[PDB]
Design a protein around this ligand. Structure first.
Ligand code: HEM
Ligand SMILES: Cc1c[nH]c(-c2ccccc2)n1
Length: 289
């Protein structure tokens, strides 16, 4: 099963920079969402959940086909809450209906990371909408109640190694959990992309507790929280070394996250040899907008 990137007809960098800018301006405008977190974090999670259905063994799932737009995937319990991100992107799509759904969902994540002061994430176009019968079944996204061995095995299906896993998980500095979405609560919140996930893991005083949905989570005195799968990154000695590395080197974290996030968003896609190079979008700040 081969998915060949096909550039939206006649489009180039500046067309996509316009879509980026529209997303970024809306991120700035709709600032009240989720008690003033804004839509950045939910857009990052959306880009990850549309990509994280991929299976390296048969090239099913992944961002290419834009299949989150279909009911089976939209209503995956694992995707509870992401409808907010989809609704945010709807007017963007209406303004730029030439862009494929997969390209828009993935571009939303890249824009959110960058606008939240994260690393630049090179991005490639050419995902093509595929039909409803190509939508992956529910159940391909990871459970949060598990341990390091589960996390390591899970991410092998996405062709991610220990460094890539630990880097990607740094996105859990962003946003918050919501009991009605996932059965986890708390931690306060954040909309600036930093390496704080790793600092919090190493420096806070953590206590395992059972929340009001009867799920276990790690809570700190200062009010932060970690999922069991987050905490597993300091329980496993291989993951712990990498946590320490990123806690001590912001730039290294940014570089590794950028590579892993681009990889995640591109898994399953064959780029022709004459395809355009990856685009690196300017932030609104860099453009004076
Ligand atoms: C073992 C892997 C992972 C597990 C079990 C997991 C689980 C979760 C859970 C349970 C939530 C809370 C959802 C809610 O209640 O609204 C969440 C939020 C979030 N996740 Fe993960 N996740 C994983 C990996 C990732 C990755 C790889 C990324 C992206 C690089 C990511 C990005 C986010 C973001 C940004 C949020 C906050 C969303 C918001 O504020 O609305 N997650 N995750
Ligand atoms: C699983 C997840 C996503 N976001 C967070 C979080 C962010 C800031 C503080 C505490 C938790 N956890």
């Amino acid at each position: 099963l081969v998915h060949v990137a096909s550039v939206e007809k006649g489009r180039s960098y500046e067309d996509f920079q316009k879509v980026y800018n529209a997303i970024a301006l809306k991120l700035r405008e709709d600032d009240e969402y989720d008690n003033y977190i804004g839509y950045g974090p939910v857009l990052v999670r959306l880009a990850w959940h549309i990509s994280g259905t991929w299976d390296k063994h048969d090239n099913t799932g992944g961002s290419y086909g834009g299949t989150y737009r279909f009911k089976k995937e939209f209503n995956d319990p694992s995707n509870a809450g992401l409808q907010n991100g989809f609704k945010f992107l709807e007017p963007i799509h209406k303004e730029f209906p030439w862009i494929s759904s997969g390209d828009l969902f993935s571009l939303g994540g890249v824009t959110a990371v960058q606008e939240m002061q994260g690393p630049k994430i090179p991005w490639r176009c050419g995902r093509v909408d595929t039909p409803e019968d190509t939508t992956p079944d529910n159940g391909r996204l990871p459970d949060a109640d598990k341990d390091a061995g589960y996390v390591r095995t899970f991410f092998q299906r996405l062709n991610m190694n220990d460094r890539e896993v630990v880097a990607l998980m740094g996105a859990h500095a962003l946003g918050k959990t919501h009991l009605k979405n996932s059965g986890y609560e708390g931690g306060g919140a954040n909309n600036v992309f930093t390496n704080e996930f790793y600092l919090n893991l190493l420096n806070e005083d953590w206590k395992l507790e059972k929340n009001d949905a009867n799920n276990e989570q790690w809570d700190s005195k200062s009010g932060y929280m970690m999922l069991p799968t987050d905490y597993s990154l300091i329980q496993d000695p291989k993951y712990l070394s990498i946590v320490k590395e990123y806690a001590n080197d912001q730039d290294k974290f940014f570089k590794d996250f950028s590579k892993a996030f681009e990889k995640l968003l591109e898994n399953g896609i064959t780029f022709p040899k004459d395809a355009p190079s990856p685009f690196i979008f300017k932030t609104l700040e860099e453009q004076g907008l």
